[PDB]
Amino acid sequence: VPPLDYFDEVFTSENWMVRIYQLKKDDAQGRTLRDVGELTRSSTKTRRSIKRPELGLRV
Amino acid sequence: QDVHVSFPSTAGKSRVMIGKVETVPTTITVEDIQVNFAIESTNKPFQNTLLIGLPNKNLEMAFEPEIKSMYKYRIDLAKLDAALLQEASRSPEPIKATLILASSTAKPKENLFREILQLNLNFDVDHSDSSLVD
Amino acid sequence: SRTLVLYDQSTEPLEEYSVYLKDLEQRNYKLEYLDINSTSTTVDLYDKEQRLFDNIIVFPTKGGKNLARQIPVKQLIKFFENEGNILCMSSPGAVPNTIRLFLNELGIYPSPKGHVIRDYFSPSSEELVVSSNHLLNKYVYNARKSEDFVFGESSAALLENREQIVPILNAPRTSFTESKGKCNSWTSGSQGFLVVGFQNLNNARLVWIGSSDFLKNKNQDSNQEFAKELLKWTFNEKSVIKSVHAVHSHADGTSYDEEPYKIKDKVIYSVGFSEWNGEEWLPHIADDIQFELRQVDPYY
Numbered sequence: 376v377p378p379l380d381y382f383d384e385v386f387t388s389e390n391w392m393v394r395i396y397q398l399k400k401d402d403a404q405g406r407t408l409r410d411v412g413e414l415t416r417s418s419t420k421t422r423r424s425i426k427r428p429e430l431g432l433r434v
Numbered sequence: 435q436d437v438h439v440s441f442p443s444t445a446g447k448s449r450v451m452i453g454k455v456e457t458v459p460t461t462i463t464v465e466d467i468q469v470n471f472a473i474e475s476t477n478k479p480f481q482n483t484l485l486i487g488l489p490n491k492n493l494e495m496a497f498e499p500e501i502k503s504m505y506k507y508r509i510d511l512a513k514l515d516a517a518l519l520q521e522a523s524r525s526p527e528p529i530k531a532t533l534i535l536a537s538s539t540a541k542p543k544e545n546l547f548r549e550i551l552q553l554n555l556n557f558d559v560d561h562s563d564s565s566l567v568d
Numbered sequence: 569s570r571t572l573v574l575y576d577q578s579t580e581p582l583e584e585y586s587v588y589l590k591d592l593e594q595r596n597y598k599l600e601y602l603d604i605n606s607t608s609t610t611v612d613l614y615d616k617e618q619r620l621f622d623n624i625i626v627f628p629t630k631g632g633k634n635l636a637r638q639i640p641v642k643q644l645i646k647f648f649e650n651e652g653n654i655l656c657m658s659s660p661g662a663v664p665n666t667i668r669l670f671l672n673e674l675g676i677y678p679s680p681k682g683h684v685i686r687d688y689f690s691p692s693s694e695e696l697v698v699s700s701n702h703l704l705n706k707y708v709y710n711a712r713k714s715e716d717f718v719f720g721e722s723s724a725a726l727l728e729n730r731e732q733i734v735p736i737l738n739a740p741r742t743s744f745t746e747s748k749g750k751c752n753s754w755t756s757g758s759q760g761f762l763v764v765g766f767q768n769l770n771n772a773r774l775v776w777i778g779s780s781d782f783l784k785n786k787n788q789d790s791n792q793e794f795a796k797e798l799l800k801w802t803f804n805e806k807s808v809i810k811s812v813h814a815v816h817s818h819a820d821g822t823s824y825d826e827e828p829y830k831i832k833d834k835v836i837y838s839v840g841f842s843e844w845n846g847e848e849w850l851p852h853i854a855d856d857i858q859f860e861l862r863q864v865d866p867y868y
């Protein structure tokens with residue numbers, strides 16, 4: 376079972392019969408909510424990686 | 435000195451030609467793949483850039499090849515255009531191509547910055563709900 | 569309105585940025601000087617989930633373990649989600665590491681060290697001078713007449729296409745960027761930017777300047793006006809907008825509660841605005857604003 380990023384658990388009953396999840400409010404800086412969870416969850420993969428990215432034109 | 439050629443090698447029915455309409459280039463000719471080869475004109479090496487786009491909307495992109503002699507500046511109108519055409523097709527304005535050739539030696543006269551096409555294309559407007567325009 | 573500066577002794581003196589600082593003190597701010605070449609932490613931005621300083625301005629350092637000891641990335645994020653304001657700059661001779669990863673995490677990409685821009689059509693061949701007909705945005709600084717801003721050796725940035733980017737100044741149309749090699753590696757043309765800004769939700773602003781010698785005492789004659797104006801925009805002192813209460817009712821006096829709406833009839837809608845120039849709230853006049861009556865799909 377992989378982890379979810381866009382939701383979070385709020386209440387879960389006694390014998391695990393009803394589970395209630397809540398939509399997580401949107402990111403205050405434009406970042407996709409998968410990328411911030413991957414940044415927090417995995418503090419490995421450190422590197423220098425000086426290379427220019429492949430972007431489109433700012434219109 | 436050197437000579438430089440140019441050709442789109444497009445994937446559509448577009449780009450009718452107009453032409454050009456201090457250290458000037460002489461002329462441009464069409465051999466009608468679909469080469470638009472000019473004649474020799476030079477000032478200095480070490481800087482060479484072809485600019486396609488329009489500066490009224492501050493939107494352009496740069497192509498920098500060399501095969502050196504002679505140069506090749508092929509401009510694919512199928513893959514190497516992203517959102518310039520979708521601005522170009524709403525309000526009909528001719529997109530331009532401009533040649534930059536310069537270097538550091540103090541020869542102000544020997545510098546080259548002048549557009550040498552005024553082309554006009556009609557492939558398709560074709561909004562695919564591509565939001566990243568305005 | 570407690571600020572907090574970060575200066576490096578080894579690269580520049582601190583008295584070289586003098587005339588912009590204490591005029592900054594004149595409208596009742598309070599500074600806080602803080603070294604990076606003296607080994608004692610003493611900087612807790614957040615204490616027991618309470619943020620202390622309102623503002624941060626930094627100065628260009630040569631990387632180092634000291635800046636990573638003072639503030640790493642996660643305190644900049646958690647500081648910046650709680651309405652703190654940042655003025656930060658870099659240099660071609662020295663780009664720090666955590667600042668570069670913080671800004672790449674925001675959405676603007678500055679060029680690393682060794683890459684420097686240059687122009688072969690400029691009227692002076694030593695420094696790099698940009699004319700005042702490149703200014704994109706208008707609500708931050710509006711150029712009254714023609715001016716010529718002076719930079720030194722400087723870096724350029726290239727950015728993404730988000731809603732929140734506010735670019736201020738641009739590169740000349742005949743520029744490029746070189747490393748030790750021979751090309752236009754990082755950016756080329758007028759797609760490099762030299763002063764950019766960033767607003768966000770829960771409104772809080774930061775600015776990036778791509779040049780070291782833009783706030784020097786020796787260069788104060790040329791660009792004194794522009795620098796003061798950025799220093800007002802960044803600290804939430806100009807161009808803020810407040811919204812007056814919005815009501816809606818029947819065409820007549822009766823409110824919605826007393827007669828709830830039928831399938832069709834006549835209503836109206838009104839709203840009001842206000843703008844703060846530093847001292848008073850004044851009325852804000854704008855030609856276009858719009859109303860939308862949507863269910864899942866706009867109707868009106």
Ligand SMILES: *[C@@H]1O[C@H](CO)[C@@H](O[C@@H]2O[C@H](CO)[C@@H](O[C@@H]3O[C@H](CO[C@@H]4O[C@H](CO)[C@@H](O)[C@H](O)[C@@H]4O)[C@@H](O)[C@H](O)[C@@H]3O[C@@H]3O[C@H](CO)[C@@H](O)[C@H](O)[C@@H]3O[C@@H]3O[C@H](CO)[C@@H](O)[C@H](O)[C@@H]3O[C@@H]3O[C@H](CO)[C@@H](O)[C@H](O)[C@@H]3O)[C@H](O)[C@H]2NC(C)=O)[C@H](O)[C@H]1NC(C)=O
Pocket residue numbers: 865866867
């Ligand atoms: C049970 O549940 C269902 C799901 O919840 C309900 O279904 C929904 O119903 C609504 C309306 O009943 C649907 O809205 C439609 O969408 C169609 C489809 O267009 C296409 O939509 C797809 C996405 O699905 C999109 O990718 C395509 O590009 C394409 O647009 C659309 O043609 C309809 O017109 C309407 O779409 C809009 O309607 C709203 C207002 O209703 C406007 O904001 C918008 O501009 C647009 O067109 C309008 O058309 C009106 C009359 O048709 C007219 O009054 C407006 O002025 C406006 O524009 C006009 O356009 C025409 C021609 O272009 C001109 O002649 C004219 O001058 C003017 O310019 C919705 O899609 C649908 N949802 C799903 C999932 O199917 C269902 O109702 C419910 N049953 C019930 C309640 O009984």
Ligand SMILES: *[C@@H]1O[C@H](CO)[C@@H](O)[C@H](O)[C@H]1NC(C)=O
Pocket residue numbers: 577578605
């Ligand atoms: C700055 O750091 C260097 C490196 O350790 C040190 O030698 C020097 O004394 C420090 N202070 C100044 C004023 O240069």
